[PDB]
Design a protein around this ligand. Structure first.
Ligand SMILES: COc1ccc2c(nc(NC(=O)c3cccnc3)[n+]3cc[nH]c23)c1OC
Length: 821
């Protein structure tokens, strides 16, 4: 490993040379305000603070205007002609946030702008020079110049020797194990493309060695029915150890060994594998040690230029029908063989290549040359299509290297929200240095939001017992390549987390009578933290916390007694920072739900549909702890049904008369009811496809502006009414007791949104598949994907699916449904 780690480090030094501290482009030292590209890009009021004016300039801008001309519009408000001012020196930042608007994007493209439009809040920007902008994260000269720290040959295709090895012993057995388990046995599996090449082979069952209670010795020769010549390069040996109790056999751990190392030489001699439990056991497997090294050599390059062949009508449609099929998922043995033989007819449909490689007969060394020949003349995939080619199913380095090269197309703003899936895809790279990890590190270098998100994702990946060692090295490389400025702020953030994690444990372990006092006392350590530190908020590092507002800090009076942490902004131009910190629940299930809901919002906005969706952030800092964004001026349905329940018992009125008290005027209420119609549609569609079946009045939330959203994603991909519309919901939508065209608008929005997710079925299956190895309780295998596919009714028309969802809505309405048509 020491050799692979050395070459990785020499590769990363070479990567840093492409990102000098001089280039402001890739080394800005500030976060970029995120953008999601929205169609038809309406006007807005923006408020810009200018250097030397007592009040900010407040004017109307076209949402379609680039930030560049917005900056200049703002300069025209103080300057007559702009031949005296250097406009290229100026930037716009969000007020209270170390975030810079991207010049060449529409004002309306920016996440912050469309959030302000949703809530109807003042758009407050600040105009200033690059010179004036906080750049305390930027890489220095020191950073670039600093290092990075975290005899004969026989070609394999000629090697006819049987793959065999001796499973010798495991050393360092616990006192715990000697009591429980009588004998132990290994189950040896050979795998490539995430699938077993043969039946797994079981070791003999042996106890601890005579006069040695810490050592199990098998000294057993395992022989597979395969030759080194038949081994794919990315072939992996898996050894799962089992303890048979004395007084079913029990899985104690698993090691993986790559039969070829990162230099393509076959594993030879004694190799040591470390499997963890809580404690470190050492497994010794002895490989043959011939007089000669064996090296894997790919087949010689096959140069061909294929395009006019036999064109037959009937089968041309059965190919087109398969090409245009929703996804590769569940494709029959016959459809694979048919597509495979017609693969060279599919060169004007790039995004189907994953279906072609999934329909390969095998990955035998002989047949690789003609697969490689296809790939290198194949047209570039769209980045989201190529995600599939980084999954378990495709181990081949040429396939994955191409998949990454096509991915270079993707924007930083699109990549930002896809990172969790990319981090998990590292588990399908057998080698440490790889096209993928270099892509991720390179994107983090050139963008601070990506580096920041990678840090927290990689820190969450460490806790994996099998892949913890791999992620340790990748995090190390990120932190090293990040520079001093970044590392120090990340350390500050990591400290604030541990302290808040500390306070929340202390708060919960306290009694009901003393809990409030324990919080007030426990917050002394974070009080002290801030006296010697200004710290960026981990959930949104554009927000700088200067001080803690101790009198506003509280516990939410729920199980898990979550903290409400109120913090003062280091920017007077900014607002207070309110955020939840919770301990006990694993938040990663919630993070995925929110990710999937956020990608649906992005898909809809890319086709002109805005369903006014509430998109809040959730960060898993440690195992079973993290920060959750607090949406202001919102309450659970139940709290509202309960608070109106005291005045009247009409039951149609609670939501309606709740929205009126905050939206009193006729145009104010109508808008809030419209916000509800659009937000409810998105929520209904998201509820059904993602299979969040466990919704109730404490689960559903409602913002005072009328926007509806989910919060507790306890149930996910439920399998076994999908959503529920109550009378009070129907009342707000209709605007009265009887059905209106507003309910027809609601029905159209649902069905339209539903169809736009169906056209992206493959993306949603790829995004959930890549989160299988992350070990979430409700997502362990491809069968969990089938539900979601089955919900999206593939190979049915938009018109056929509109009737299916319309009947889901009518079904949801319950007994009131009879009143509607
Ligand atoms: C008054 O109580 C709340 C107002 C807003 C809240 C809010 N709670 C929120 N979060 C949650 O309920 C939650 C639970 C489990 C995993 N993720 C989020 N949450 C997320 C976004 N906004 C809000 C209030 O808490 C009851």
């Amino acid at each position: 490993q020491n050799d692979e780690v050395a070459a990785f480090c020499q590769s990363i030094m070479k990567l840093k040379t492409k990102f000098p501290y001089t280039d402001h482009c890739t080394n800005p030292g500030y976060l970029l305000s995120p953008v999601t590209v929205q169609r038809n890009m309406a006007s807005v009021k923006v408020s810009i603070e200018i250097e030397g004016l007592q009040l900010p300039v407040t004017f109307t801008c076209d949402v379609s205007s680039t930030v560049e001309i917005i900056i200049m519009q703002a300069l025209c408000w103080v300057h007559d002609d702009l031949n005296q001012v250097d406009v290229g020196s100026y930037i716009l930042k969000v007020c209270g946030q170390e975030e810079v608007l991207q010049n060449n994007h529409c004002l309306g493209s920016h996440e912050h702008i469309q959030n302000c439009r949703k809530w109807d809040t003042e758009i407050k920007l600040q105009l200033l020079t690059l010179s004036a902008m906080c750049q305390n994260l930027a890489r220095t000269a020191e950073d670039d110049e600093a290092p990075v720290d975290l005899r004969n040959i026989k070609e394999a295709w000629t090697a006819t020797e049987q793959l065999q090895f001796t499973v010798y012993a495991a050393h360092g057995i616990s006192s715990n194990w000697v009591s429980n388990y009588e004998k132990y046995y290994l189950i040896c599996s050979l795998s490539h493309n995430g699938k077993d090449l043969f039946k797994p082979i079981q070791s003999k069952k042996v106890g601890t060695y005579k006069n040695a209670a810490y050592l199990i010795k098998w000294d057993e020769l395992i022989i597979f029915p395969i030759q080194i010549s038949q081994l794919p390069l990315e072939s992996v040996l898996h050894l799962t150890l089992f303890g048979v109790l004395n007084q079913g056999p029990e899985a104690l751990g698993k090691v993986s060994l790559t039969l070829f190392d990162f230099k393509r030489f076959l594993t030879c001699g004694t190799k040591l594998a470390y499997l963890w439990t809580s404690e470190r056991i050492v497994l010794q497997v002895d490989f043959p040690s011939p007089a000669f090294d064996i090296i894997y050599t790919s087949p010689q390059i096959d140069r061909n230029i294929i395009k006019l062949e036999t064109l037959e009508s009937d089968i041309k449609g059965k190919l087109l029908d398969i090409i245009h099929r929703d996804s590769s998922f569940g494709l029959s043995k016959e459809d694979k063989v048919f597509l495979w033989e017609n693969r060279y007819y599919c060169l004007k449909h790039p995004n189907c290549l994953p279906k072609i490689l999934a329909s390969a007969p095998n990955w035998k060394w002989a047949n690789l040359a003609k697969t490689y020949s296809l790939l290198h003349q194949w047209p570039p995939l769209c980045p989201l299509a190529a995600l599939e080619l980084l999954d378990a199913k495709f181990a081949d380095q040429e396939v994955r290297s191409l998949a990454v090269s096509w991915m270079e197309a993707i924007s930083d703003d699109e990549l930002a929200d896809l990172l969790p899936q990319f981090v998990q895809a590292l588990k399908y790279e057998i080698y440490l240095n790889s096209s993928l990890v270099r892509f991720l590190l390179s994107r983090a270098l050139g963008n601070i939001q990506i580096a920041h998100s990678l840090y927290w994702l990689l820190k969450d990946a460490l806790h994996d017992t099998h892949f913890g060692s791999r992620y340790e090295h990748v995090l190390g490389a990120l932190l090293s390549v990040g520079g001093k400025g970044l590392r120090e702020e990340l350390s500050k953030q990591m400290k604030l987390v541990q302290l808040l994690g500390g306070v929340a444990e202390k708060v919960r372990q306290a009694s009901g009578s003393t809990r409030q006092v324990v919080l007030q006392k426990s917050m002394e350590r974070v009080q002290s933290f801030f006296l010697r530190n200004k710290c960026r908020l981990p959930l949104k590092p554009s927000l700088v916390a200067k001080e803690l507002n101790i009198k506003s800090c509280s516990f939410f009076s729920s199980n898990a007694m979550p903290l409400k942490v109120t913090m003062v902004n280091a920017d007077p131009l900014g607002e207070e920072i309110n955020v939840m910190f919770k301990v006990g629940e694993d938040l990663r299930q919630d993070m995925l739900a929110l990710q999937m809901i956020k990608i649906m919002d992005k898909i809809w906005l890319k086709e002109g549909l805005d369903l006014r969706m509430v998109i809040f952030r959730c960060l898993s800092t440690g195992r079973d702890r993290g920060m959750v964004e607090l949406v202001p001026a919102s309450d659970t349905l139940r709290k509202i049904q309960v608070e109106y329940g005291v005045t009247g018992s009409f039951k149609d009125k609670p939501l309606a008369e709740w929205l009126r008290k905050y939206n009193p005027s006729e145009e104010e209420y109508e808008k809030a009811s419209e916000n509800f119609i659009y937000s409810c549609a998105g929520c209904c569609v998201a509820t059904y496809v993602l299979g969040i079946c466990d919704r109730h009045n404490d689960n559903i939330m409602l913002r005072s502006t009328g926007h509806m959203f989910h919060i507790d994603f306890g149930k996910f991909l439920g399998h076994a009414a999908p959503f529920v519309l109550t009378s009070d919901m129907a009342y707000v939508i209709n605007g009265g007791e009887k059905p209106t065209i507003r309910f027809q608008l609601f029905v159209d929005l649902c069905c339209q949104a539903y169809n736009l997710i169906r056209k992206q079925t493959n993306l949603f299956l790829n995004l959930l598949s890549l989160m299988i190895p992350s070990g979430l309780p409700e997502l362990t295998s491809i069968q969990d994907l089938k539900y979601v596919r089955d919900a999206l009714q593939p190979q049915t028309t938009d018109a056929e699916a509109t009737i299916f969802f319309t009947r889901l809505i009518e079904s949801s309405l319950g007994s009131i449904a009879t009143k509607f048509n």
